[PDB]
Design an enzyme around this catalytic site. Structure first.
Site, PDB file in Angstrom:
ATOM      1  N   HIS A  40      -8.409  17.517  10.905  1.00  0.00           N
ATOM      2  CA  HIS A  40      -9.464  17.653  10.337  1.00  0.00           C
ATOM      3  C   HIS A  40     -10.182  16.604   9.715  1.00  0.00           C
ATOM      4  O   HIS A  40     -11.227  16.718   9.254  1.00  0.00           O
ATOM      5  CB  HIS A  40      -9.482  18.919   9.472  1.00  0.00           C
ATOM      6  N   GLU A  52      -2.266  -0.541   0.227  1.00  0.00           N
ATOM      7  CA  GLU A  52      -3.414  -0.312  -0.893  1.00  0.00           C
ATOM      8  C   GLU A  52      -2.687   0.339  -2.191  1.00  0.00           C
ATOM      9  O   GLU A  52      -1.881   1.149  -2.245  1.00  0.00           O
ATOM     10  CB  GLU A  52      -4.285   0.860  -0.491  1.00  0.00           C
ATOM     11  N   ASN A  54      -5.074   0.227  -5.822  1.00  0.00           N
ATOM     12  CA  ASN A  54      -6.393   0.470  -6.144  1.00  0.00           C
ATOM     13  C   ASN A  54      -7.163   0.438  -5.109  1.00  0.00           C
ATOM     14  O   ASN A  54      -7.430  -0.754  -4.374  1.00  0.00           O
ATOM     15  CB  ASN A  54      -6.813  -0.523  -7.241  1.00  0.00           C
ATOM     16  N   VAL A  57     -10.593  -2.485  -5.436  1.00  0.00           N
ATOM     17  CA  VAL A  57     -10.405  -3.761  -5.699  1.00  0.00           C
ATOM     18  C   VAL A  57      -9.300  -4.088  -4.749  1.00  0.00           C
ATOM     19  O   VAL A  57      -8.325  -3.731  -4.482  1.00  0.00           O
ATOM     20  CB  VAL A  57      -9.646  -3.667  -6.988  1.00  0.00           C
ATOM     21  N   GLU A  62      -2.978  -5.994   0.863  1.00  0.00           N
ATOM     22  CA  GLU A  62      -3.947  -5.494   1.735  1.00  0.00           C
ATOM     23  C   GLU A  62      -3.793  -5.843   3.022  1.00  0.00           C
ATOM     24  O   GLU A  62      -3.999  -6.962   3.351  1.00  0.00           O
ATOM     25  CB  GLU A  62      -5.412  -4.975   1.610  1.00  0.00           C
ATOM     26  N   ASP A 171      -0.808  20.156  -7.258  1.00  0.00           N
ATOM     27  CA  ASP A 171      -0.848  20.467  -5.903  1.00  0.00           C
ATOM     28  C   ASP A 171      -1.501  19.101  -5.268  1.00  0.00           C
ATOM     29  O   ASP A 171      -1.891  18.283  -6.173  1.00  0.00           O
ATOM     30  CB  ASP A 171      -2.065  21.502  -5.892  1.00  0.00           C
ATOM     31  N   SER A 172      -1.621  18.922  -3.915  1.00  0.00           N
ATOM     32  CA  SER A 172      -2.517  18.045  -3.346  1.00  0.00           C
ATOM     33  C   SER A 172      -4.038  18.748  -3.362  1.00  0.00           C
ATOM     34  O   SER A 172      -4.177  19.688  -4.051  1.00  0.00           O
ATOM     35  CB  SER A 172      -2.172  17.836  -2.093  1.00  0.00           C
ATOM     36  N   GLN A 174      -8.672  17.937  -2.217  1.00  0.00           N
ATOM     37  CA  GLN A 174      -9.547  17.263  -1.427  1.00  0.00           C
ATOM     38  C   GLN A 174      -9.404  15.718  -1.460  1.00  0.00           C
ATOM     39  O   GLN A 174      -9.305  15.290  -2.525  1.00  0.00           O
ATOM     40  CB  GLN A 174     -10.820  17.904  -1.998  1.00  0.00           C
ATOM     41  N   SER A 177      -6.075  14.959   1.988  1.00  0.00           N
ATOM     42  CA  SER A 177      -5.926  15.575   3.448  1.00  0.00           C
ATOM     43  C   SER A 177      -5.452  14.562   4.349  1.00  0.00           C
ATOM     44  O   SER A 177      -5.740  13.273   4.359  1.00  0.00           O
ATOM     45  CB  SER A 177      -7.357  16.110   3.985  1.00  0.00           C
ATOM     46  N   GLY A 178      -4.429  14.647   5.366  1.00  0.00           N
ATOM     47  CA  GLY A 178      -4.031  13.654   6.100  1.00  0.00           C
ATOM     48  C   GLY A 178      -2.836  12.749   5.477  1.00  0.00           C
ATOM     49  O   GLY A 178      -2.209  12.404   6.375  1.00  0.00           O
TER      50      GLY A 178
HETATM   51 CA   LIG Z   1      -7.018  -2.430  -2.883  1.00  0.00          CA
END
Ligand SMILES: [Ca+2]
Length: 223
Positions: A40, A52, A54, A57, A62, A171-172, A174, A177-178
């Site tokens: 989805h 990642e 933040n 930033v 990364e 809970d998780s 919005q 997801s994924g």
């Molecule tokens: Ca970052």
């Protein structure tokens, strides 16, 4: 993640953000060139962001790598969210290190009562909207099939399980997801769906990854 905790930078090294100009979904790194996420979450134009904390930033660990291909599960049903799983291939292999690392696939399904770690950059409010910039974490158990089916009559397939707390508050949500549900160092779930977030008697519903290991491995081997 509602009712969780700040994970700590790069403590969840398989957690990825899917970015299309903005964070829109989580995912899990399963080898140097492949990510697992929720069907989805499909869209074209994905950049995968590894390492990642933040997400607003640049902090120095990364890796941003464009997807070359996305593969939605062949039986995905967007109405019922049955088979809510997709694979994303990176255009180049990520550089694996202590802060960017793959998570193992299960060799066996988990059981009700197992404790798992759920993570993401989704909404932190159960009624309201507040999006964190740093990664959030929640420890939660897998619930029984019977309690899962009782919570969501007529909606839970053999490719879903419930995890969380029937009392609400954790809970998780919005934007999660994924992303991953990891139990004893194995990827057992993918954040899929739920009624609202953190509501009483409405736990999170997750894609049951152990049912898809054959498909994942064959798909990777030929793409
Ligand atoms: Ca970052």
């Amino acid at each position: 993640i509602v009712g969780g905790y700040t994970c700590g930078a790069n403590t969840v090294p398989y957690q990825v953000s899917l970015n299309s100009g903005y964070h829109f979904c989580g995912g899990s790194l399963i080898n140097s060139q492949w990510v697992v996420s929720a069907a989805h979450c499909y869209k074209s134009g994905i950049q995968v962001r590894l390492g990642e904390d933040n997400i607003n930033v640049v902090e120095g660990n990364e890796q941003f790598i464009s997807a070359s291909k996305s593969i939605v599960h062949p039986s995905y049903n967007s109405n019922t969210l049955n088979n809510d799983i997709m694979l994303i291939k990176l255009k180049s292999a990520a550089s694996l290190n202590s802060r960017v690392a793959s998570i193992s696939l299960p060799t066996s399904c988990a059981s009700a009562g197992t404790q798992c770690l759920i993570s993401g950059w989704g909404n932190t409010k159960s009624s309201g909207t507040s999006y964190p910039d740093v990664l959030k974490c929640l420890k939660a158990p897998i619930l029984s099939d019977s309690s899962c089916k009782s919570a969501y009559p007529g909606q839970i397939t053999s490719n879903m399980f419930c995890a969380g707390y029937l009392e609400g508050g954790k809970d998780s949500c919005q934007g999660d997801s994924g992303g991953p549900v990891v139990c004893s160092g194995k990827l057992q779930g993918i954040v899929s769906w739920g009624s609202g977030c953190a509501q009483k008697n409405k736990p999170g519903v997750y894609t049951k990854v152990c049912n898809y290991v054959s498909w994942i491995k064959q798909t990777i081997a030929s793409n």
